Symmetry: D2
Subunit: 250 residues, 4 copies
């Protein structure tokens, strides 16, 4: 089991990429708490992966600072000290910078930027200096590297996550905290939400978007996260891991 003894929080773990991360984490021996906004979805998601000795759902919005405190306490009460934080919760807005309302701007940043900050800050505090082989995996995207004219606020958030994570990685390394911090950068990934938008997958699969001519699947992101959570990656910190079908290579 590649994640023997690990205890992970996966935010936005009830759908899509986060769900697959949780699934493979459990497969590799981790205990996992998944978060999401909705109880129906979250309880189904947890039980689809395993019983409560290995996976539990907690309703939590990543923008909710006070709830973060409680989430660590709930997770540690269930499974012992947290070792691994996957800051995956996120939302999207389909607006150019020009067309973004300030309400849209603040709402997207409250999840995609504040939530990652809250989980990273608290993860460092609660995991440092415990010999846990701790790992914080911050979910950026291809939009942390390149612009998309239709994703202005999203681009801001993903670029912020990219560089903030390097700061945290460095501080943890220099202080010998036994905490690593890295970013994962998915390209386009097939999910029910993509399937719900007519034409989206075909748009994303054009060669001028994804050179492989198709989009990825959630397990593509799960497997790089297993590597990063595991002690196999004990010398990797402050780095970006891109799984994008070639999107950013052209």
């Amino acid at each position: 089991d590649r994640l023997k003894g690990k205890v992970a929080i996966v935010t936005g773990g009830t759908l899509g990429i986060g769900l697959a991360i949780a699934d493979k984490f459990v497969e590799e021996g981790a205990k996992v708490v998944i978060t999401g906004r909705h109880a129906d979805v979250g309880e189904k998601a947890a039980k689809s992966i395993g019983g409560t000795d290995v996976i539990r759902f907690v309703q939590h919005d990543a923008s909710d600072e006070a709830g973060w405190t409680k989430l660590f306490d709930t997770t540690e009460e269930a499974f012992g000290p947290v070792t691994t934080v996957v800051n995956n919760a996120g939302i999207a807005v389909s607006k150019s910078v020009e067309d973004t309302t300030t309400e849209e701007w603040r709402k997207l940043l409250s999840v995609n930027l504040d939530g990652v900050f809250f989980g990273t800050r608290l993860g460092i505090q609660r995991m440092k200096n415990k010999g846990l082989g701790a790992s914080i995996i911050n979910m950026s995207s291809i939009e942390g590297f390149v612009g998309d004219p239709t994703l202005g606020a999203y681009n801001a958030s993903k670029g912020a996550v990219r560089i903030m994570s390097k700061s945290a990685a460095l501080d943890c390394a220099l202080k010998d905290y036994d905490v690593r911090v890295n970013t994962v950068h998915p390209g386009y990934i097939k999910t029910p939400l993509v399937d719900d938008l007519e034409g989206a997958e075909e748009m994303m699969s054009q060669r001028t978007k994804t050179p492989m001519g198709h989009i990825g699947e959630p397990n593509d992101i799960a497997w790089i996260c297993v590597y990063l959570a595991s002690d196999e990656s004990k010398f990797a910190t402050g780095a970006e891991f891109v799984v994008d079908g070639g999107y950013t290579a052209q």
Copy 2:
């Protein structure tokens, strides 16, 4: 005059880098409005560069959304349609991610991230489709490329500016708006604020920080901004311009 006919807003234009940008912009034939928080400083700054036929001060906090509207109106009433926006206002917090309070986080992002968003969004709206050769110059820094363990929130802000700017550049290019958007990335620059912090310049001048073994001066940033504001750079958009003494090259 390399900026003949240009009309620029330079936020945080009363001190340091912004002041030098304003100075060289006026030298190259632009009309300039500089903003800053404090009237004493701002009125002295404007008159040190020129008379009110070429430069004026407006008291404005870049985090103040409603004031942005008014700032464009004031500038256009003085000098005619704005052509050039330099989003330079910024603040700093000397805290690791771990140690950043949420108040510090939100306050820094309100200037360094929201202010750049507000000026970029409004600049696109008010400059597009006017044949102005319009240019938005967003001030990132070396901390938009690399982490600094002591500058967590600052890193978040500068990474956000870096990538958000690419989104805006692309939208403007694809829609033929005649608006370019680029980022400038200073390394360490000698200013009175650096001089006020005992030991700072020597720290910044170590070869492991700045390979040139000294730090820069405000005109180093002014001259790259003249290039970017001018029609000389009409094919440059979505790009990062690094003036850092080699900091990021190692």
Copy 3:
């Protein structure tokens, strides 16, 4: 076994990083041919990992174009069609650009650049369109991202490998070849050759070099290569994977 059915060529596989890659590849079910310059070293290396049903040594200099042809034939005769090429062979020269002789320049590029080209070109030709889940892993380094004043020719070679690999990745993706191409970028890795240079590890472990305050081990590079060789990484192509203790994050 994470590399079930894979058949790998690991150049420079008799020492250091390459040896560890070969070791973990065999552990994960691959068949492996390792190359190196010297028979004594190579035969000991192969037998330290396994018997000839899983690993064999072939004496080969990666700069030797004609030998590449033969190497694929030898490997396929032993183990069946090659699926995985790790272009790891390399040499180093400790000279600034200013001080590099043309002989040094050409010799280093013949291994570090031509060898990677030869293995990549031939790997595409011999692995495309066979449903192998083929993967070409080109060993760049931190010196593919940042300069080192003492490693001028080495920097040239590693930057060339970095970007050439993206070209190959794209061509393979666009043509549906079922071949991925990625680069791995080690930071400093403890080996007998580092141990032989008095003071080297301490130099490399300074916080201004490696923020973790120590250097890595060969298995750190082996494990990212297992991920990249395996079908777990089927959506990763054209990307750079950095395992450097934080070197490039500051």
Copy 4:
């Protein structure tokens, strides 16, 4: 005159980008030697810009190491000590990595990589420690950042130039040589050679290639080179300057 007192060598200065660099350098007060392969073209090019008190042609192939020595001597005899080297000579091959012959590979690298090495190495040696405000401008391209499946060897060369230049920049900075080294990265630029290839400009102008929906002109590259040659850029070293119509921003 922004280049008062400068003495520049511009390789491949008889056509296209190099010709425009030479033209604007002379306009800004520099003395210039342009090189090229062909006397007819070179003598016409020089006289189109000015008389022999400001510009001269020397027939030289950048791959010719012995000729480099002589080129500096010729230039210094004409105009005094060289201050500025623009390594612009280059060739292209339209082949994937898979399809590149070794002859094509070596020939392209002899100009695009060896020529830049020869000019950089010799420029450092002959310009260091003379108080000249010396500047080496190495012409990379967008193909130093991103792959193109049809430009495998070209990608290798441009990535090598990109990173080798950082090594040189650092060495010069650390040793206080008064020599800066930077790379320029053109996107697509309209020239007679592009005009000669039916359909090329339209291909390059598609929004999925160049977001501005058109390609650039040689003066777009000349003006960034004026900035980099001038003392305005005295704090810029080891950096990449991208003028690409947005190509790399998406």
